Amino acid sequence: IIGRYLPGTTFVYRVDPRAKLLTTFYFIIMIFLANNWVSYLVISIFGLAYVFATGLKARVFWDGVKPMIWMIVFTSLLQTFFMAGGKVYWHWWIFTLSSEGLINGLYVFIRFAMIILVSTVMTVTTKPLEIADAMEWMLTPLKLFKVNVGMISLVISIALRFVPTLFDQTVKIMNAQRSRGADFNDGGLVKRAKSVVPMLVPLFIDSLEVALDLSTAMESRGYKGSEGRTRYRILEWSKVDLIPVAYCLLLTILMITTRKH
Amino acid sequence: AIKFENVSYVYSPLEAIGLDQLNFSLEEGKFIALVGHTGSGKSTLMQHFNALLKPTSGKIEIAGYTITPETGNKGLKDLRRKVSLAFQFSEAQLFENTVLKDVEYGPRNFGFSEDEAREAALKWLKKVGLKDDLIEHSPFDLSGGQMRRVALAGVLAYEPEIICLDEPAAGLDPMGRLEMMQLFKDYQAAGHTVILVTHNMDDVADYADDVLALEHGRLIKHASPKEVFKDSEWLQKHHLAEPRSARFAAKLEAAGLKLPGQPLTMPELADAIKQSLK
Amino acid sequence: GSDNIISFDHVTFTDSPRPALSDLSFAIERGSWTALIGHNGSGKSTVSKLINGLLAPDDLDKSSITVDGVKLGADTVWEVREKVGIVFQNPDNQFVGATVSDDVAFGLENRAVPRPEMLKIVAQAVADVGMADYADSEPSNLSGGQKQRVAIAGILAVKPQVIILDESTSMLDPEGKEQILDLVRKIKEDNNLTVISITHDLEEAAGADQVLVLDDGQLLDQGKPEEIFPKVEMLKRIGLDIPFVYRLKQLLKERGIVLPDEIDDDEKLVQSLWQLNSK
Amino acid sequence: KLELRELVLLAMVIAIKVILGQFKVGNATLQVGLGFIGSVMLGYLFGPWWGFAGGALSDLVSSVIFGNLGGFFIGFTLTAALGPMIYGFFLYKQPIQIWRVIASVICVTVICNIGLNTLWVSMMYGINFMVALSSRILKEMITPWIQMVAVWFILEGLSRVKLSRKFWS
Numbered sequence: 001i002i003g004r005y006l007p008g009t010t011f012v013y014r015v016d017p018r019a020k021l022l023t024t025f026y027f028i029i030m031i032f033l034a035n036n037w038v039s040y041l042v043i044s045i046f047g048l049a050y051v052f053a054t055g056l057k058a059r060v061f062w063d064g065v066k067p068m069i070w071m072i073v074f075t076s077l078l079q080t081f082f083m084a085g086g087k088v089y090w091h092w093w094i095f096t097l098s099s100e101g102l103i104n105g106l107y108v109f110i111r112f113a114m115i116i117l118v119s120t121v122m123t124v125t126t127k128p129l130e131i132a133d134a135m136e137w138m139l140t141p142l143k144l145f146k147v148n149v150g151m152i153s154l155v156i157s158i159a160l161r162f163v164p165t166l167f168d169q170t171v172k173i174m175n176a177q178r179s180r181g182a183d184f185n186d187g188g189l190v191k192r193a194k195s196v197v198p199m200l201v202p203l204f205i206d207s208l209e210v211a212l213d214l215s216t217a218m219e220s221r222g223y224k225g226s227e228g229r230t231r232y233r234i235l236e237w238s239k240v241d242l243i244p245v246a247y248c249l250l251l252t253i254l255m256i257t258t259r260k261h
Numbered sequence: 262a263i264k265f266e267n268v269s270y271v272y273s274p275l276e277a278i279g280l281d282q283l284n285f286s287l288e289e290g291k292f293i294a295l296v297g298h299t300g301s302g303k304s305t306l307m308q309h310f311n312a313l314l315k316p317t318s319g320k321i322e323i324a325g326y327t328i329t330p331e332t333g334n335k336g337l338k339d340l341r342r343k344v345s346l347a348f349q350f351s352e353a354q355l356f357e358n359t360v361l362k363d364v365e366y367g368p369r370n371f372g373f374s375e376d377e378a379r380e381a382a383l384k385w386l387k388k389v390g391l392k393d394d395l396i397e398h399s400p401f402d403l404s405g406g407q408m409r410r411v412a413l414a415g416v417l418a419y420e421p422e423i424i425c426l427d428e429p430a431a432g433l434d435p436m437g438r439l440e441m442m443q444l445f446k447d448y449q450a451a452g453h454t455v456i457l458v459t460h461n462m463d464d465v466a467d468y469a470d471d472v473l474a475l476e477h478g479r480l481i482k483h484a485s486p487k488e489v490f491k492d493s494e495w496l497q498k499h500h501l502a503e504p505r506s507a508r509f510a511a512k513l514e515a516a517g518l519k520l521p522g523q524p525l526t527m528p529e530l531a532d533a534i535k536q537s538l539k
Numbered sequence: 540g541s542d543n544i545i546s547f548d549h550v551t552f553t554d555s556p557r558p559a560l561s562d563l564s565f566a567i568e569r570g571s572w573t574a575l576i577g578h579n580g581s582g583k584s585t586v587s588k589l590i591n592g593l594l595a596p597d598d599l600d601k602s603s604i605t606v607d608g609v610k611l612g613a614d615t616v617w618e619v620r621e622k623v624g625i626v627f628q629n630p631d632n633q634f635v636g637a638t639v640s641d642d643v644a645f646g647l648e649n650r651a652v653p654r655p656e657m658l659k660i661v662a663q664a665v666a667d668v669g670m671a672d673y674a675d676s677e678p679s680n681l682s683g684g685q686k687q688r689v690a691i692a693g694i695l696a697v698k699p700q701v702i703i704l705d706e707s708t709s710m711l712d713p714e715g716k717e718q719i720l721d722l723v724r725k726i727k728e729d730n731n732l733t734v735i736s737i738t739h740d741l742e743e744a745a746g747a748d749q750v751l752v753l754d755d756g757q758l759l760d761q762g763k764p765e766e767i768f769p770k771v772e773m774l775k776r777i778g779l780d781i782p783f784v785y786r787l788k789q790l791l792k793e794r795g796i797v798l799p800d801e802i803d804d805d806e807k808l809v810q811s812l813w814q815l816n817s818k
Numbered sequence: 819k820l821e822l823r824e825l826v827l828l829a830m831v832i833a834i835k836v837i838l839g840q841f842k843v844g845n846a847t848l849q850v851g852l853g854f855i856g857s858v859m860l861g862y863l864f865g866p867w868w869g870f871a872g873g874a875l876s877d878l879v880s881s882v883i884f885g886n887l888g889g890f891f892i893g894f895t896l897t898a899a900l901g902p903m904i905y906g907f908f909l910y911k912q913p914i915q916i917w918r919v920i921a922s923v924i925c926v927t928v929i930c931n932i933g934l935n936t937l938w939v940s941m942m943y944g945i946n947f948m949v950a951l952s953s954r955i956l957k958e959m960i961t962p963w964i965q966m967v968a969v970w971f972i973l974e975g976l977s978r979v980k981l982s983r984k985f986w987s
C-alpha cells in the first residue's frame with residue numbers, strides 16, 4: 001500500500017527525476033493541444049513508445065486503471081451522448097448515438113488512457129525520495145518572491161518520512177479501540193460520525209508528542225536555519241537526460257503542424 | 262480452555278511467515294506468560310485472541326467461540342467482550358473528556374446500562390489505585406503513571422475473562438510495577454486468565470504458571486517456569502533470557518554451594534541460601 | 540578537572556507553580572562516566588536540556604553553566620551546542636533524516652561541511668556504530684536498537700566532547716540495552732569522550748564512575764556507586780529499584796546473615812558466601 | 819513567524835491529512851473518503867494562510883507516496899490547497915458554532931469540489947463543462963450532508979485536545 005517502485009534495468013530508470021517530471025508535466029500540457037484525429041494518433045504513438053520503453057508488464061498499468069475505470073466509461077458515454085452529428089445509428093427518446101459522438105467518446109478515452117499511462121510510468125519508475133528532491137528543486141522559482149523554500153523542503157521531507165510511521169500508529173490505535181469494543185462502520189450516520197474521534201484524537205496527541213520531540217532533536221543538533229546548509233543527496237544531470245528533451249521537443253513540433261492549427 | 266489447532270498466519274513478494282504450526286491448549290485461570298526474542302511473533306499470536314487477525318489455515322477455540330479462516334467480522338462484539346487486549350503503550354489510546362467517561366467508554370460499547378457502566382468504572386478506578394479526586398480531570402492532563410492506570414482500568418472494567426496484556430508495566434516505577442502485577446495476580450484469583458507478554462523474565466518467574474516460548478513464529482516449549490529454566494544452554498541457544506535469581510544460583514553453583522531445589526524468586530533464593538548454610 | 544559545572548539554578552517552566560529545578564550544584568570530571576538517577580519526573584531531562592544550552596536559567600545573574608571552560612550565555616549557545624550531543628529517549632522520534640546515512644549527515648549539514656568531506660565522515664561514523672550494512676535503509680525497516688545506534692552515529696559525526704544519553708536505552712529489549720551500552724562504552728574509550736547517562740535503572744549506573752541522585756529537582760546525594768547504593772533507605776524512599784546484589788544482601792540480613800557493606804557486585808558476594816559456608 | 823515546533827507540527831498534520839485520504843467510511847452503496855478531515859485540522863489549528871501551504875504540500879506528498887493516479891497537474895494542487903484556506907477563514911480561532919461549520923462545508927463544496935475541480939477535469943479531458951458537472955454531481959451533492967457532521971465531531975475533539983496541557987500555547 002505504501003510505495004509503488006518496481007526495480008529494473010531499462011534506460012527510463014536512469015533518467016534524472018527532474019527531467020522525467022518535467023517531461024510528464026509537458027506531456028500533460030501537450031495533451032490539451034491535440035484535436036484532429038491524426039494528432040491523437042501522434043499522442044497514442046508517443047505514449048505507447050514511452051510505455052514500451054519503460055519495459056513494464058501490463059498488469060501494473062491495469063492496476064493503475066482499475067480504480068477509475070468506471071469514471072472513464074461514464075465520462076466517455078456522457079460525451080458520446082451529449083454531442084451528436086452525422087449518422088444516428090441506434091436511437092431512443094433522448095439517447096442519440098452518433099458517429100461524431102462515438103469518435104468523441106473514443107477521443108476522450110484516449111486522453112484518459114494516455115494521462116493514466118504517463119502518470120503511472122512516473123509513479124512506478126522512480127523512488128519517492130527522488131520525486132521529493134525533484135519537487136524541492138522545481139520549487140526554486142519561488143525564491144524570486146522572497147518566500148523561503150528551505151522551510152518548504154524541510155516540511156515536505158519530514159511529512160514524507162513520517163507518513164508510514166503515522167500510518168502504523170493509526171492502524172495500531174484503531175486495533176486497540178476495536179479491542180475495547182468500538183465499532184468503526186456500523187450504527188447509522190451519527191454513530192459512524194462519532195466513531196471517528198477515537199481514530200483521530202489519540203493520533204493527534206501522538207503527533208503533538210512526536211512534533212515536540214523531533215523539534216527538540218533538530219534544535220539540539222544545530223538547526224539554526226535553512227540558510228547556510230549544504231546537502232547530502234544531490235541530483236546530477238547525465239547524458240541520458242538528453243533522451244527526454246530531444247523526445248520532449250519533437251512532440252511539440254508535430255502538434256505545431258499535425259493539428260488543425 | 263483456549264485451544265489452537267494448526268493456527269498459522271502469513272502476511273505477493275513480501276509473504277512472511279508471521280506464525281507457524283501452533284499446538285497448545287491453555288487452561289483457564291492460570292497466569293500464562295508469553296516469551297520470545299524480538300521479532301518472534303508474540304504480538305501476532307496475541308492479536309489472535311480477540312480475532313483482530315484471523316488464521317490463514319487453522320482453528321481457534323477461544324472462550325467457547327470458534328474462529329476459522331473464513332469467519333467474518335460480524336458477531337465478534339460478544340467475543341471481544343470476553344477477551345480484552347491491552348496493547349504495549351495503552352496510554353496512547355485515551356481520548357475522552359474526563360477520566361470517568363474514558364473508563365466507561367469501554368462498558369458502554371457492550372450493552373452496559375449507563376448507571377451500571379458508571380458504577381463499574383468507579384469500582385475499577387478505585388481498584389487500580391487512582392486517586393478519588395482525579396476521576397474528573399482530563400485524561401490528557403495526567404502523568405504517565407496515571408495515564409497507564411486509567412488505560413488499564415479501561416480495557417478491564419467490563420470484567421473480561423481471557424485478558425491479554427502486552428507489557429502492562431513497561432514504564433512504571435518499581436512500586437507501580439509491583440502494584441500492577443499484584444492487581445493482575447489478584448484478578449486471576451477470581452477465575453480469569455491473564456495471558457501476559459513480557460520480555461522481562463523476573464516477574465514471569467515470580468508469578469506465571471505457564472510459559473509459552475516462541476521461536477521465529479513457532480511454539481517451542483510450553484510448561485511451568487520451574488521446568489523451563491532448568492538448563493541455561495537451551496535458553497541461550499534459543500535467545501530466551503533467564504531470571505536474575507536463576508543466573509545467580511547457577512553462578513554460585515560453580516563455587517560448589519549445592520543449593521537444594523531450584524531457586525527462581527528472590528525470597529526463594531534467600532531461603533535456599535539460609536537453608537544451605539546449616 | 541571539571542569539564543562541566545553547574546552553579547545555583549532555577550528553571551521554573553513557563554507558568555507552573557513550583558520550580559522544576561531548585562538550587563542544583565554538581566561537577567563532572569572529564570572522561571568519567573557519570574550517571575544521573577532520579578524518580579520518574581524528578582527533573583533529569585531538564586538538566587539534560589540545560590547542559591547543551593537548549594534552555595537557560597531564569598536568574599542569569601547568579602547562575603553558572605560552564606561547559607569545557609566556556610560559560611553559557613545568550614551569545615554562546617550555538618558554540619556549546621556544538622561540543623555537547625544528546626541521545627533522546629524515543630528511538631524513532633529523533634530520527635530526522637529520510638534514511639540512515641542521511642540522518643547521520645544532518646549534524647554535518649547544519650555546519651555547512653563540504654560534501655566531499657561529508658561523504659567520508661558519514662561513512663566512517665556509520666562504520667563506528669556497526670551499521671555499515673544498513674546504510675540508506677528506511678526508518679520503518681529498523682528496530683529500536685538500530686535506530687538508537689544510528690542516532691549515536693549522528694551525534695558522533697560532529698565529534699562532540701560530551702554524550703548525554705537521555706534515557707537512550709529505556710525502550711528496548713535487555714539484549715538491545717546491553718548491546719548499546721557496550722557500543723557507547725567502546726566509542727567513549729576510542730574517541731576519549733565524557734558520557735553522562737540519565738537512567739531510572741540502577742544496574743546501568745552500577746558501572747558509572749560517578750552517580751548523581753536527583754530528588755524533586757535537588758541534588759540529594761552524590762558519590763561513587765559503591766558508596767551511594769549501600770544506603771538503601773534513601774533509594775527505597777524516593778522510589779528506585781535497588782540493584783539485585785544489595786536487595787539479596789538485605790534479604791539475607793533480614794533472615795539473619797550480616798555481611799559487610801563493602802560487598803558490592805555479584806562475584807564478591809559469591810566468594811564471601813563461599814568462605815562463610817566453608818566454616 | 820512559525821517556531822520550529824509549529825513547523826514540525828505542520829508536517830505532522832500534513833502527514834495525517836495524507837493518511838486520512840485513504841481511510842474510507844461507509845458501505846458498498848456509498849463510500850466517503852476521510853481526506854476532508856485533514857483539511858479542517860489545517861483550517862482549525864494553523865489558520866488559512868498556512869492552511870494553503872499545508873494543503874498544497876499534502877497533495878504533493880500524496881502524489882509522491884500513494885501516487886497521483888489522476889495525472890500530474892497544478893490545478894489539482896490548487897484545489898487541494900484551496901480547501902484548508904476556506905476552513906481556516908471560517909473556523910481558525912473563532913469559537914465553536916454550528917452555522918460556521920455548515921457554511922464552511924457548503925462553501926468548500928461549492929468552490930473546491932464543484933466549480934473548480936470540475937473545471938480542471940473539463941479542461942484536462944476536453945469534455946464540456948456540463949458533462950463533467952453532471953458526471954460527478956451525485957457525490958458532490960450527497961457528501962456535504964455527511965461532512966457537516968463528521969467535521970463537527972472532529973472539531974469537537976480538537977477543541978477538547980487544545981484545552982489540555984499537551985498543547986503548549
Ligand SMILES: Nc1ncnc2c1ncn2[C@@H]1O[C@H](COP(=O)(O)OP(=O)(O)NP(=O)(O)O)[C@@H](O)[C@H]1O
Binds near residue numbers: 271277280299302
Ligand atoms: N501483519 C503481519 N502479519 C504477520 N507478520 C507480520 C505482519 N507485519 C509484519 N510481520 C512480520 O512478522 C514478524 C513477527 O511480527 P511481530 O508479531 O510484530 O513480532 P513481535 O516480536 O511480536 N513484535 P514485538 O512486540 O515488538 O516483539 C516480523 O518479522 C514482522 O516484520
Ligand SMILES: Nc1ncnc2c1ncn2[C@@H]1O[C@H](COP(=O)(O)OP(=O)(O)NP(=O)(O)O)[C@@H](O)[C@H]1O
Binds near residue numbers: 553555578581584
Ligand atoms: N513542558 C513542560 N511544561 C511544564 N512542566 C513541565 C514540562 N516538562 C516537564 N515539566 C515538569 O517539570 C518537572 C521535570 O520534568 P522532566 O525533567 O522532563 O521529568 P522527567 O524526569 O524527564 N520525566 P522522565 O523522562 O520519565 O524521567 C516535572 O515535574 C514535569 O512534570
Ligand SMILES: [Mg+2]
Binds near residue numbers: 303304349458
Ligand atoms: Mg509486545
